[PDB]
Short mmCIF file of C-alpha atoms in Angstrom, two decimals:
data_model
loop_
_atom_site.label_atom_id
_atom_site.label_comp_id
_atom_site.label_asym_id
_atom_site.label_seq_id
_atom_site.Cartn_x
_atom_site.Cartn_y
_atom_site.Cartn_z
CA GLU A 421 -9.98 -7.80 -3.01
CA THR A 422 -10.58 -9.28 0.51
CA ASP A 423 -7.22 -7.76 1.42
CA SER A 424 -7.92 -4.33 -0.25
CA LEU A 425 -6.12 -1.31 0.99
CA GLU A 426 -9.57 0.16 1.73
CA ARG A 427 -10.22 -2.79 4.15
CA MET A 428 -6.81 -2.47 5.81
CA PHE A 429 -7.04 1.32 6.14
CA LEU A 430 -10.49 1.00 7.76
CA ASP A 431 -9.10 -1.80 10.01
CA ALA A 432 -6.25 0.39 11.21
CA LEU A 433 -8.47 3.34 11.98
CA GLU A 434 -10.79 1.15 14.19
CA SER A 435 -7.65 -0.14 15.97
CA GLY A 436 -6.38 3.46 16.48
CA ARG A 437 -3.17 2.46 14.68
CA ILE A 438 -3.33 5.62 12.71
CA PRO A 439 0.44 6.19 12.74
CA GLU A 440 1.21 2.93 11.03
CA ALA A 441 -1.61 3.54 8.40
CA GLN A 442 -0.02 6.99 8.14
CA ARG A 443 3.44 5.67 7.33
CA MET A 444 1.90 3.14 4.85
CA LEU A 445 -0.19 5.50 2.65
CA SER A 446 2.48 8.24 2.33
CA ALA A 447 5.08 5.57 1.32
CA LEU A 448 2.42 4.68 -1.30
CA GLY A 449 2.02 8.44 -1.75
CA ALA A 450 5.75 8.76 -2.53
CA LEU A 451 5.55 6.26 -5.46
CA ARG A 452 2.92 8.24 -7.40
CA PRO A 453 3.88 10.42 -10.45
CA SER A 454 3.96 14.09 -9.63
CA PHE A 455 3.59 17.51 -11.30
CA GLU A 456 5.39 20.62 -10.05
CA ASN A 457 3.55 23.02 -12.24
CA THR A 458 0.01 23.01 -13.74
CA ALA A 459 1.44 23.35 -17.32
CA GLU A 460 2.47 19.73 -16.89
CA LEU A 461 -1.21 18.71 -16.69
CA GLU A 462 -3.64 17.81 -19.63
CA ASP A 463 -6.32 19.84 -17.82
CA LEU A 464 -7.13 21.48 -14.45
CA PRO A 465 -9.89 19.72 -12.39
CA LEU A 466 -13.36 20.34 -13.74
CA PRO A 467 -15.89 22.11 -11.43
CA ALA A 468 -19.26 20.48 -10.77
CA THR A 469 -22.21 22.87 -10.71
CA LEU A 470 -24.31 22.07 -7.66
CA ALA A 471 -26.75 24.95 -7.70
CA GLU A 472 -27.69 27.91 -9.89
CA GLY A 473 -29.21 31.32 -9.32
CA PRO A 474 -29.14 35.11 -9.79
CA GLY A 475 -27.69 35.98 -6.36
CA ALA A 476 -24.09 36.99 -5.94
CA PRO A 477 -21.43 36.25 -4.90
CA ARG A 478 -21.32 32.68 -6.06
CA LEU A 479 -19.78 29.94 -3.90
CA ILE A 480 -16.93 27.69 -4.99
CA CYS A 481 -16.34 24.73 -2.71
CA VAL A 482 -13.06 22.79 -2.31
CA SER A 483 -13.33 19.01 -1.90
CA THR A 484 -11.71 17.66 1.26
CA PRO A 485 -8.42 15.80 0.78
CA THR A 486 -10.01 12.56 2.01
CA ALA A 487 -10.08 9.31 0.08
CA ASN A 488 -13.90 9.29 0.11
CA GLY A 489 -14.08 13.09 -0.62
CA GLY A 490 -15.18 14.83 -3.83
CA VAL A 491 -17.82 17.23 -5.14
CA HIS A 492 -20.62 15.19 -3.60
CA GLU A 493 -19.44 16.61 -0.25
CA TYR A 494 -21.25 19.88 -0.81
CA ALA A 495 -24.43 18.58 -2.53
CA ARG A 496 -26.58 18.93 0.61
CA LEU A 497 -25.08 22.24 1.53
CA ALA A 498 -25.66 23.42 -2.06
CA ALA A 499 -29.32 22.22 -1.97
CA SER A 500 -30.20 25.19 0.35
CA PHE A 501 -28.88 27.54 -2.33
CA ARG A 502 -30.83 26.01 -5.24
CA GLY A 503 -32.43 28.87 -7.20
CA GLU A 504 -30.76 31.51 -5.03
CA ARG A 505 -27.11 31.55 -6.41
CA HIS A 506 -24.41 29.57 -8.25
CA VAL A 507 -22.60 26.93 -6.19
CA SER A 508 -19.82 24.77 -7.64
CA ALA A 509 -17.38 22.32 -6.12
CA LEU A 510 -13.86 21.40 -7.22
CA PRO A 511 -12.43 17.86 -7.27
CA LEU A 512 -8.74 17.63 -6.15
CA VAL A 513 -6.34 16.35 -8.78
CA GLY A 514 -4.77 12.93 -8.15
CA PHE A 515 -7.71 11.05 -6.56
CA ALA A 516 -8.77 9.47 -9.97
CA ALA A 517 -6.60 6.50 -11.12
CA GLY A 518 -4.50 8.08 -13.97
CA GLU A 519 -3.98 11.53 -12.38
CA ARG A 520 -0.77 13.00 -11.10
CA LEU A 521 -0.28 14.44 -7.64
CA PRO A 522 1.08 17.84 -6.57
CA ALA A 523 4.87 17.61 -5.90
CA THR A 524 5.03 20.52 -3.38
CA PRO A 525 2.61 22.40 -1.00
CA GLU A 526 2.80 25.47 -3.22
CA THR A 527 1.79 23.37 -6.28
CA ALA A 528 -1.19 21.97 -4.35
CA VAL A 529 -2.42 25.50 -3.35
CA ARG A 530 -1.87 26.73 -6.92
CA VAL A 531 -3.89 24.01 -8.49
CA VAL A 532 -6.76 24.78 -6.10
CA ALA A 533 -6.43 28.55 -6.79
CA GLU A 534 -6.39 28.00 -10.60
CA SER A 535 -9.37 25.68 -10.71
CA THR A 536 -11.19 28.19 -8.44
CA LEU A 537 -10.51 30.93 -10.97
CA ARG A 538 -11.88 28.81 -13.80
CA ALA A 539 -15.00 27.89 -11.72
CA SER A 540 -15.62 31.56 -11.03
CA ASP A 541 -16.37 32.36 -14.65
CA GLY A 542 -14.91 35.80 -13.99
CA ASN A 543 -17.66 36.61 -11.49
CA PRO A 544 -17.24 37.74 -7.82
CA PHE A 545 -16.83 34.53 -5.77
CA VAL A 546 -16.33 33.15 -2.33
CA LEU A 547 -14.20 30.17 -1.50
CA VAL A 548 -15.66 27.61 0.84
CA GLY A 549 -14.04 24.67 2.61
CA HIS A 550 -15.31 22.19 5.11
CA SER A 551 -12.90 20.83 7.64
CA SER A 552 -9.47 20.08 6.09
CA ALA A 553 -10.58 21.78 2.86
CA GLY A 554 -10.72 25.11 4.67
CA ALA A 555 -6.98 25.61 4.95
CA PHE A 556 -6.76 25.03 1.17
CA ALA A 557 -9.66 27.40 0.49
CA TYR A 558 -8.02 29.95 2.75
CA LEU A 559 -4.50 29.73 1.23
CA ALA A 560 -5.94 29.63 -2.29
CA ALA A 561 -7.61 33.00 -1.50
CA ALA A 562 -4.28 34.35 -0.19
CA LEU A 563 -2.37 33.14 -3.23
CA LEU A 564 -4.93 34.58 -5.69
CA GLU A 565 -4.71 37.99 -3.87
CA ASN A 566 -0.87 37.93 -3.70
CA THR A 567 -0.04 36.45 -7.13
CA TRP A 568 -2.75 37.77 -9.44
CA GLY A 569 -4.27 40.57 -7.37
CA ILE A 570 -7.61 38.76 -7.74
CA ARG A 571 -9.54 38.89 -4.51
CA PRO A 572 -12.36 36.54 -3.58
CA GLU A 573 -15.24 38.44 -1.86
CA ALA A 574 -14.68 36.20 1.05
CA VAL A 575 -13.60 32.87 2.46
CA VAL A 576 -15.92 30.65 4.46
CA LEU A 577 -14.54 27.98 6.75
CA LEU A 578 -16.90 25.20 8.06
CA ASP A 579 -15.36 24.16 11.35
CA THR A 580 -11.72 24.11 10.08
CA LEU A 581 -8.76 23.62 12.51
CA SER A 582 -6.18 26.49 12.83
CA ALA A 583 -7.21 11.87 15.54
CA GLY A 584 -10.58 10.27 16.36
CA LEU A 585 -11.85 13.08 14.04
CA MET A 586 -10.09 11.26 11.13
CA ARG A 587 -11.67 8.05 12.55
CA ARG A 588 -15.23 9.43 12.66
CA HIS A 589 -15.04 10.88 9.16
CA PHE A 590 -14.51 7.32 7.97
CA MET A 591 -16.67 5.74 10.70
CA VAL A 592 -19.96 7.46 9.71
CA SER A 593 -21.49 8.40 -3.57
CA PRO A 594 -20.65 6.18 -0.60
CA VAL A 595 -17.41 6.33 -2.61
CA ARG A 596 -15.02 3.35 -2.96
CA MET A 597 -11.55 4.06 -1.55
CA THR A 598 -9.36 2.94 -4.42
CA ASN A 599 -5.68 2.75 -4.03
CA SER A 600 -5.32 6.10 -5.89
CA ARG A 601 -7.83 7.79 -3.59
CA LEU A 602 -5.98 6.53 -0.51
CA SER A 603 -2.55 7.49 -1.78
CA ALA A 604 -3.91 10.86 -3.03
CA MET A 605 -5.32 11.41 0.45
CA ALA A 606 -1.81 10.81 1.99
CA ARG A 607 -0.16 13.25 -0.39
CA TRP A 608 -2.67 16.02 -0.04
CA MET A 609 -2.90 15.66 3.76
CA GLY A 610 0.89 15.59 3.94
CA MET A 611 1.02 18.84 1.92
CA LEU A 612 -1.53 20.41 4.28
CA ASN A 613 0.79 19.74 7.15
CA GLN A 614 3.60 21.71 5.46
CA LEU A 615 1.64 24.73 4.20
CA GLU A 616 3.21 28.11 4.94
CA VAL A 617 0.65 30.38 6.71
CA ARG A 618 -0.12 33.61 4.82
CA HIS A 619 -2.47 36.56 5.21
CA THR A 620 -5.49 37.27 3.07
CA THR A 621 -7.13 40.69 3.44
CA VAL A 622 -10.59 39.42 2.32
CA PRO A 623 -13.36 38.89 4.89
CA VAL A 624 -13.23 35.47 6.51
CA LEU A 625 -16.11 33.61 8.21
CA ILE A 626 -15.41 30.67 10.56
CA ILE A 627 -18.63 28.73 11.23
CA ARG A 628 -18.12 26.63 14.42
CA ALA A 629 -20.14 23.43 15.10
CA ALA A 630 -21.58 24.09 18.59
CA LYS A 631 -21.58 20.29 19.52
CA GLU A 632 -17.74 19.74 19.37
CA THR A 633 -14.94 19.92 21.98
CA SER A 634 -7.74 39.34 7.90
CA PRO A 635 -11.10 40.64 9.20
CA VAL A 636 -12.42 37.46 10.95
CA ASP A 637 -16.01 36.76 11.94
CA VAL A 638 -17.18 33.74 13.86
CA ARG A 639 -20.64 32.18 14.00
CA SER A 640 -21.98 29.08 15.65
CA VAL A 641 -24.28 26.49 14.25
CA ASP A 642 -26.37 23.95 16.16
CA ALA A 643 -24.55 20.94 14.68
CA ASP A 644 -21.51 18.70 14.91
CA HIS A 645 -18.44 18.69 12.55
CA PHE A 646 -20.10 16.17 10.28
CA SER A 647 -23.77 17.09 10.67
CA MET A 648 -23.02 20.70 9.68
CA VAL A 649 -22.82 19.63 6.00
CA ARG A 650 -25.37 16.81 6.28
CA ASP A 651 -28.63 16.94 8.42
CA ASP A 652 -27.90 20.46 9.65
CA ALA A 653 -26.79 21.82 6.20
CA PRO A 654 -29.73 24.33 6.06
CA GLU A 655 -28.72 26.01 9.36
CA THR A 656 -25.11 26.24 8.05
CA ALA A 657 -26.30 27.60 4.72
CA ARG A 658 -28.46 30.28 6.37
CA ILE A 659 -25.59 31.57 8.48
CA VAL A 660 -23.54 31.72 5.31
CA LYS A 661 -26.26 33.54 3.30
CA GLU A 662 -26.96 36.00 6.13
CA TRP A 663 -23.24 36.71 6.71
CA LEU A 664 -22.67 37.27 3.00
CA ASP A 665 -25.68 39.60 2.70
CA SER A 666 -24.33 41.68 5.64
CA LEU A 667 -21.17 42.54 3.60
CA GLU B 1080 -7.19 -2.96 -10.79
CA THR B 1081 -5.34 -0.37 -12.94
CA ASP B 1082 -3.83 1.14 -9.75
CA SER B 1083 -3.14 -2.24 -8.08
CA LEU B 1084 -0.14 -2.65 -5.84
CA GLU B 1085 1.03 -5.37 -8.21
CA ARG B 1086 1.16 -2.76 -11.03
CA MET B 1087 2.90 -0.29 -8.69
CA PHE B 1088 5.54 -2.85 -7.70
CA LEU B 1089 6.27 -3.88 -11.33
CA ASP B 1090 6.40 -0.18 -12.52
CA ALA B 1091 8.83 0.45 -9.64
CA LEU B 1092 11.01 -2.47 -10.75
CA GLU B 1093 11.12 -1.11 -14.32
CA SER B 1094 11.92 2.39 -13.00
CA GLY B 1095 14.60 1.61 -10.35
CA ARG B 1096 12.41 2.50 -7.42
CA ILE B 1097 12.77 -0.85 -5.57
CA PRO B 1098 13.81 0.68 -2.34
CA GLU B 1099 10.68 2.95 -2.29
CA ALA B 1100 8.49 -0.07 -3.18
CA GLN B 1101 10.04 -2.14 -0.37
CA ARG B 1102 9.49 0.71 2.14
CA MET B 1103 5.81 0.87 1.14
CA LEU B 1104 5.33 -2.90 1.31
CA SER B 1105 7.12 -3.19 4.75
CA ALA B 1106 4.97 -0.35 5.91
CA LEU B 1107 1.94 -2.36 4.75
CA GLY B 1108 3.42 -5.50 6.33
CA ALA B 1109 3.57 -3.73 9.74
CA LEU B 1110 -0.22 -3.26 9.64
CA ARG B 1111 -0.86 -6.97 9.50
CA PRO B 1112 -1.16 -9.12 12.60
CA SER B 1113 1.96 -11.02 13.50
CA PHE B 1114 2.84 -14.10 15.52
CA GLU B 1115 6.00 -14.72 17.57
CA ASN B 1116 5.10 -18.31 18.63
CA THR B 1117 3.93 -20.96 16.15
CA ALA B 1118 1.25 -22.19 18.60
CA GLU B 1119 -0.53 -18.91 17.83
CA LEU B 1120 -1.50 -20.22 14.36
CA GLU B 1121 -4.68 -22.21 13.88
CA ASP B 1122 -2.50 -24.50 11.69
CA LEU B 1123 0.96 -24.79 10.16
CA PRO B 1124 1.37 -24.27 6.39
CA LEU B 1125 0.01 -27.30 4.48
CA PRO B 1126 2.59 -29.20 2.32
CA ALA B 1127 1.65 -29.92 -1.27
CA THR B 1128 2.70 -33.31 -2.58
CA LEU B 1129 4.31 -32.94 -6.03
CA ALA B 1130 5.72 -36.45 -6.44
CA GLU B 1131 5.45 -39.89 -4.83
CA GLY B 1132 7.72 -42.91 -5.02
CA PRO B 1133 9.43 -45.86 -3.17
CA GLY B 1134 12.84 -44.14 -2.97
CA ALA B 1135 14.40 -42.25 -0.11
CA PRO B 1136 15.16 -39.77 1.25
CA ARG B 1137 12.11 -37.61 0.38
CA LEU B 1138 12.62 -33.98 -0.59
CA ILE B 1139 10.96 -31.07 1.22
CA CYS B 1140 11.02 -27.85 -0.79
CA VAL B 1141 10.74 -24.36 0.72
CA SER B 1142 8.84 -21.81 -1.40
CA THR B 1143 10.78 -18.61 -2.18
CA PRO B 1144 9.67 -15.49 -0.16
CA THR B 1145 8.62 -13.72 -3.37
CA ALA B 1146 5.23 -12.34 -4.18
CA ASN B 1147 4.84 -14.78 -7.14
CA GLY B 1148 6.40 -17.79 -5.27
CA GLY B 1149 4.73 -20.84 -3.80
CA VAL B 1150 4.57 -24.62 -4.06
CA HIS B 1151 4.27 -24.41 -7.88
CA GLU B 1152 7.90 -23.28 -8.01
CA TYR B 1153 9.13 -26.90 -7.51
CA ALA B 1154 6.51 -28.65 -9.69
CA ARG B 1155 8.92 -28.90 -12.66
CA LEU B 1156 11.84 -30.16 -10.62
CA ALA B 1157 9.40 -32.57 -8.89
CA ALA B 1158 8.33 -33.87 -12.34
CA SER B 1159 11.80 -35.62 -12.68
CA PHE B 1160 10.99 -37.60 -9.48
CA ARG B 1161 7.29 -38.53 -10.04
CA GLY B 1162 7.76 -42.32 -9.85
CA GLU B 1163 11.07 -42.33 -8.08
CA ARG B 1164 10.33 -40.62 -4.64
CA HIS B 1165 8.18 -38.38 -2.50
CA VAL B 1166 8.67 -34.61 -3.09
CA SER B 1167 6.70 -31.98 -1.31
CA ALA B 1168 6.77 -28.25 -1.13
CA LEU B 1169 5.94 -25.91 1.71
CA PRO B 1170 3.91 -22.66 1.45
CA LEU B 1171 5.18 -19.78 3.57
CA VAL B 1172 2.66 -18.46 6.06
CA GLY B 1173 1.44 -14.90 5.60
CA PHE B 1174 1.16 -14.89 1.81
CA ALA B 1175 -2.54 -15.65 1.94
CA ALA B 1176 -5.05 -13.04 3.06
CA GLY B 1177 -6.17 -14.93 6.14
CA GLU B 1178 -2.73 -15.24 7.59
CA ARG B 1179 -0.47 -13.75 10.16
CA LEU B 1180 3.12 -12.85 9.43
CA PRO B 1181 6.16 -13.83 11.44
CA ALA B 1182 7.24 -11.10 13.91
CA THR B 1183 10.89 -11.98 13.96
CA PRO B 1184 13.64 -13.79 12.00
CA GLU B 1185 13.58 -16.62 14.55
CA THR B 1186 9.85 -17.07 14.29
CA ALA B 1187 10.27 -17.28 10.49
CA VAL B 1188 12.92 -19.96 10.78
CA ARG B 1189 10.83 -21.95 13.36
CA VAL B 1190 7.69 -21.97 11.27
CA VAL B 1191 9.72 -23.34 8.35
CA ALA B 1192 11.41 -25.97 10.60
CA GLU B 1193 8.01 -27.05 12.01
CA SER B 1194 6.31 -27.17 8.62
CA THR B 1195 9.15 -29.30 7.34
CA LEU B 1196 8.63 -31.90 10.10
CA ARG B 1197 4.97 -32.00 9.30
CA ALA B 1198 5.87 -32.63 5.62
CA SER B 1199 8.43 -35.31 6.39
CA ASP B 1200 5.86 -37.36 8.28
CA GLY B 1201 8.49 -39.33 10.26
CA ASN B 1202 10.64 -40.20 7.18
CA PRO B 1203 14.29 -39.37 6.36
CA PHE B 1204 14.17 -36.12 4.45
CA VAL B 1205 16.15 -33.50 2.62
CA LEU B 1206 15.46 -29.80 2.84
CA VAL B 1207 15.68 -27.89 -0.42
CA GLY B 1208 15.53 -24.25 -1.26
CA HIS B 1209 15.85 -22.35 -4.54
CA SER B 1210 17.29 -18.90 -4.39
CA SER B 1211 16.17 -16.78 -1.44
CA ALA B 1212 14.42 -19.88 0.00
CA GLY B 1213 17.97 -21.21 0.47
CA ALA B 1214 18.85 -19.41 3.64
CA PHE B 1215 15.48 -20.42 5.21
CA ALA B 1216 15.96 -24.06 4.25
CA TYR B 1217 19.49 -24.05 5.55
CA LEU B 1218 18.70 -22.30 8.78
CA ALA B 1219 15.59 -24.50 9.42
CA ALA B 1220 17.93 -27.52 8.97
CA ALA B 1221 20.32 -25.93 11.56
CA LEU B 1222 17.50 -25.25 14.04
CA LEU B 1223 16.10 -28.79 13.61
CA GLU B 1224 19.53 -30.17 14.49
CA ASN B 1225 20.68 -27.74 17.21
CA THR B 1226 17.40 -27.15 19.08
CA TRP B 1227 15.29 -30.28 18.49
CA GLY B 1228 18.12 -32.80 17.81
CA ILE B 1229 16.61 -33.89 14.47
CA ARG B 1230 18.83 -34.03 11.42
CA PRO B 1231 17.76 -33.79 7.82
CA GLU B 1232 19.77 -36.23 5.64
CA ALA B 1233 20.91 -33.18 3.69
CA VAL B 1234 20.26 -29.62 2.58
CA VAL B 1235 20.25 -28.74 -1.07
CA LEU B 1236 20.67 -25.16 -2.14
CA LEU B 1237 19.72 -24.27 -5.63
CA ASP B 1238 21.84 -21.26 -6.70
CA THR B 1239 21.59 -19.67 -3.25
CA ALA B 1240 19.09 -6.23 -8.48
CA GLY B 1241 18.12 -7.10 -12.05
CA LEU B 1242 17.90 -10.70 -10.67
CA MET B 1243 14.76 -9.11 -9.17
CA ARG B 1244 13.66 -7.78 -12.61
CA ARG B 1245 14.51 -11.11 -14.16
CA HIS B 1246 12.55 -12.88 -11.45
CA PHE B 1247 9.45 -10.73 -11.87
CA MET B 1248 9.46 -10.57 -15.72
CA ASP B 1249 6.03 -16.99 -16.63
CA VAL B 1250 4.76 -20.51 -17.59
CA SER B 1251 2.59 -20.46 -14.38
CA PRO B 1252 2.04 -16.65 -13.75
CA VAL B 1253 0.78 -15.60 -10.30
CA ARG B 1254 -1.42 -12.66 -9.26
CA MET B 1255 0.70 -10.65 -6.76
CA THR B 1256 -2.04 -9.93 -4.24
CA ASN B 1257 -1.60 -7.25 -1.50
CA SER B 1258 -1.10 -10.12 0.98
CA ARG B 1259 1.59 -11.66 -1.24
CA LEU B 1260 3.38 -8.30 -1.69
CA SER B 1261 3.38 -7.46 1.99
CA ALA B 1262 4.33 -10.98 3.00
CA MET B 1263 7.23 -10.69 0.58
CA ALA B 1264 8.49 -7.48 2.18
CA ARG B 1265 8.32 -8.95 5.72
CA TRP B 1266 10.00 -12.33 4.82
CA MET B 1267 12.65 -10.83 2.51
CA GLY B 1268 13.11 -8.11 5.11
CA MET B 1269 14.29 -10.77 7.55
CA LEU B 1270 17.03 -12.12 5.28
CA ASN B 1271 19.21 -9.18 6.34
CA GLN B 1272 18.51 -9.97 10.00
CA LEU B 1273 19.47 -13.68 9.78
CA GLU B 1274 22.64 -14.76 11.66
CA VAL B 1275 24.26 -17.91 10.25
CA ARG B 1276 24.22 -21.15 12.30
CA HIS B 1277 26.33 -24.19 11.70
CA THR B 1278 24.81 -27.61 11.14
CA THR B 1279 26.67 -30.84 10.61
CA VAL B 1280 24.35 -32.27 7.89
CA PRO B 1281 25.71 -32.55 4.34
CA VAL B 1282 25.01 -29.45 2.29
CA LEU B 1283 24.99 -29.49 -1.51
CA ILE B 1284 25.10 -26.13 -3.29
CA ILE B 1285 24.11 -26.44 -6.96
CA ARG B 1286 25.57 -23.34 -8.71
CA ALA B 1287 23.90 -21.87 -11.82
CA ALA B 1288 27.02 -21.82 -14.05
CA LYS B 1289 25.61 -19.04 -16.35
CA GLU B 1290 25.52 -16.58 -13.44
CA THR B 1291 29.37 -16.90 -13.08
CA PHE B 1292 31.67 -14.65 -15.27
CA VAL B 1293 29.61 -28.63 1.70
CA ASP B 1294 29.79 -29.90 -1.88
CA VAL B 1295 29.51 -27.53 -4.80
CA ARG B 1296 28.26 -28.89 -8.11
CA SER B 1297 27.29 -26.70 -11.04
CA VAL B 1298 24.73 -27.18 -13.67
CA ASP B 1299 24.57 -25.64 -17.09
CA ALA B 1300 21.83 -23.12 -16.42
CA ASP B 1301 20.90 -19.70 -15.11
CA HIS B 1302 19.31 -18.85 -11.77
CA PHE B 1303 15.83 -19.33 -13.31
CA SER B 1304 16.24 -22.11 -15.88
CA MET B 1305 17.70 -24.45 -13.21
CA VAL B 1306 14.10 -25.00 -11.92
CA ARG B 1307 12.43 -24.54 -15.28
CA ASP B 1308 13.91 -25.86 -18.59
CA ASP B 1309 17.12 -27.18 -16.97
CA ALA B 1310 15.16 -28.80 -14.08
CA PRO B 1311 15.81 -32.33 -15.42
CA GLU B 1312 19.57 -31.82 -15.07
CA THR B 1313 19.19 -30.15 -11.63
CA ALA B 1314 17.07 -33.12 -10.51
CA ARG B 1315 19.76 -35.63 -11.74
CA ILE B 1316 22.59 -33.89 -9.87
CA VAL B 1317 20.41 -33.92 -6.75
CA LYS B 1318 19.48 -37.64 -7.00
CA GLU B 1319 23.03 -38.69 -7.85
CA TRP B 1320 24.48 -36.66 -5.03
CA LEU B 1321 22.02 -38.02 -2.50
CA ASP B 1322 22.75 -41.50 -3.84
CA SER B 1323 26.51 -40.83 -2.93
CA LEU B 1324 25.35 -40.48 0.61
#
């Protein structure tokens, strides 16, 4: 299509008309079939193994809720761990054409927490999330601790917030933004916005990108929000490995 | 493809989620460039000639503001006129991917009025609209008279919701592109915002008798067959009524 929703979304982002594109994709969002509970699904999302190794704890990465997001997001990051430890990434359900979307915030966190558990293979694990994925990684850790009394060893956040940023994500698997991806993005981002904050007791690392305007540690990487999981992935990875070894 | 907006809209129709589908399509509509003045457009809609003949007055048909609508909608009716007189049909602007959408109800009515004059080409003409095109035909006729002092010979209204589900369940089937869907929401959206205007030209309403449980005539047909299989009879009533003038 010359008039694809991908084209018109990208148009509206360049024109800073992000509120109108906002109202559009969530109205599309609202028309998608929903699940309230993971028992309604044929299967949980399948983890993609991105690295292997004998080190521990393994890393489980949450895809960002962006229409071009997916397991590919962590391939470069995972490359610095090749041979050193297991790294997997989780797709988010609803971004492929026949998939249902989470009906409530709680359902969205649960589905992340359940697919995390499966990816773990029963082994000690840490949850990682870049950017918008970090809140989901973080609340998935909290929900696992509070619901099943299963604690991740840690959570690692790659420049996550507590705009033009949305714009530059899409301005930079150069994946095609299908209708389902774009509507799934609206739904998941809309859930993010309504997530109830909750405490995890497991160690948390916030890696901050030095180029940008319950026990918590903070480290800085010589990178921007985007380069931290691209060109500068090795610096990010090394901070992660060194923080995890200091536990 | 499998998750097209066309498939979404038609699923929504089947499931009683029209209002949600309309909200989404208006929301998409709002992201397209608009015009408030016709001189903003590189060109008016282009009439399509469906019939030609020595008789008079010519008929100018206004496409319905539906995602599957267009000049083809009057091709059957025009078939009953194809050696008797000129019949053309107007596209509505905005349904094609290039195009801008009207910003207001008045803009919508003006673009139809102006297109119609282009189609008439200085001849006596009648404005005709099936269904939801009816109000736009009528109101363009009123604006032509009241603002520009030019009078159609007449206006003909052809039978002017599961009518929706009926409508969207063909014949000459049309791909409902994202541009067609969004143009539909914007143009149909303005139907609610239209204030009636009076016009002194003769107005024939042809009623689809099978929908029932200023001259009015009725024809033995439903809302849809009156421009499809019962088009010959619709065309006769039209020609005989105009001949009375």
